[PDB]
Amino acid sequence: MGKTLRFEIVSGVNKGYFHTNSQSESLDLVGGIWQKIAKEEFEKSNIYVSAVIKPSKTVYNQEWGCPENGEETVVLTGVANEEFVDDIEKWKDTVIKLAKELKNQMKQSTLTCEFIETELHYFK
Amino acid sequence: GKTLRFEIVSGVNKGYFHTNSQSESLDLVGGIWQKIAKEEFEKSNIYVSAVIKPSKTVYNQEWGCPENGEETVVLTGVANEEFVDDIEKWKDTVIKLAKELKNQMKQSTLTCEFIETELHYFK
Amino acid sequence: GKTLRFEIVSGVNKGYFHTNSQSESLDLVGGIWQKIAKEEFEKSNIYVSAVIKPSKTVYNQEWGCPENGEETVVLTGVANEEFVDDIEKWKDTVIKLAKELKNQMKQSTLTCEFIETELHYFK
Numbered sequence A: 001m002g003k004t005l006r007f008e009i010v011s012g013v014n015k016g017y018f019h020t021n022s023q024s025e026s027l028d029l030v031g032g033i034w035q036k037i038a039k040e041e042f043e044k045s046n047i048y049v050s051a052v053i054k055p056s057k058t059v060y061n062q063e064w065g066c067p068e069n070g071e072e073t074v075v076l077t078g079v080a081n082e083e084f085v086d087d088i089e090k091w092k093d094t095v096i097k098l099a100k101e102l103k104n105q106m107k108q109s110t111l112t113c114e115f116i117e118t119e120l121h122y123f124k
Numbered sequence B, C: 001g002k003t004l005r006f007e008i009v010s011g012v013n014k015g016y017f018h019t020n021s022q023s024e025s026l027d028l029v030g031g032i033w034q035k036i037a038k039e040e041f042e043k044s045n046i047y048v049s050a051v052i053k054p055s056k057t058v059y060n061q062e063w064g065c066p067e068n069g070e071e072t073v074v075l076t077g078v079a080n081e082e083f084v085d086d087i088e089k090w091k092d093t094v095i096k097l098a099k100e101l102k103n104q105m106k107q108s109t110l111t112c113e114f115i116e117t118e119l120h121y122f123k
Ligand SMILES: CSC[C@H]1O[C@@H](n2cnc3c(N)ncnc32)[C@H](O)[C@@H]1OP(=O)(O)OC[C@H]1O[C@@H](n2cnc3c(N)ncnc32)[C@H](O)[C@@H]1O
Pocket: A047, A048, A049, A050, A051, A052, A077, A078, A079, A084, C009, C010, C011, C057, C058, C059, C060, C063, C070, C072, C108, C109, C110, C111
């Protein structure tokens, strides 16, 4: 019953720039970018932030640029595991740094990053 | 950035809408949400966006769950203070929209959860 | 309606079940969940349903992650007072199911989280 934090990031996939065709292709695109930026930060701080990535669409007003029925998006989540990181604040600052880097590399005008309290049970 | 997020789980009612794939039912729910969100936005100036995800929900087959699980859609959202000036009013709007979604999807039941969250919005 | 939700993340072990697509992985994991949930329901009269979502999980390639991520499934659920009287007993049941799922999926590790939530159930 370790009290910790989870994050959730939502990003567009910018098909106008990366020209991905399917949701598997955009999932792999975002996953590859996260894999690179997470490793780069891990080399600097010894904190590796893994991410679960999920296909999704995001529904907003068509006048703001949303396609009918929703924009293709990826949801990234993760959770601070005390077996891997000993400082929750540093982990949180790392997630924020990665979220801003993801926004930049995905060429997104906006991005959301949330933190939620969670109780993590890790079975090994 | 302390705020609220919601999560709604809905069936896709294949027998009523006659969709044939997870992608089609995702777009069905997306279109319904897009319409009810716009309709409410016109009445109150509050627009509730939703992230929608494909899913399968597993429960007891004795209660009607299909062998391979029920095709469902998960909808989530979060109150951003840049777009809504009162979180409680936003929460009440989400509840209203969830009940509308339940009715439009012809669902017998629906869950709508609220979770405390800290939102960081980069622009 | 203050309560708890769970989230479990599991690998899908394509190298033990010979599967490929994400829809096929949802069906494999959903079938396992149906069976273990029913088994626990018979013992405790607590049935834990699950919403299952397709995903990939990104971690260091040096630790065995494929480039761009490993195929995974995310399972979530929520304790509903209409179906369970004691949230502590529900939580212990979820933990038992999570450990059983880890074994059935032949996974070296598994995460199970509990998050405070406010559930609105419309029926
Ligand atoms: C789908 S399970 C696969 C991998 O997927 C990641 N993962 C699992 N569940 C989650 C979750 N809920 N949210 C985010 N990432 C997750 C974790 O990185 C997990 O790694 P393991 O715990 O299985 O360790 C595997 C190896 O990798 C090392 N390792 C895994 N993660 C980290 C880490 N963050 N820092 C340092 N070492 C790590 C660990 O020591 C071990 O040798």
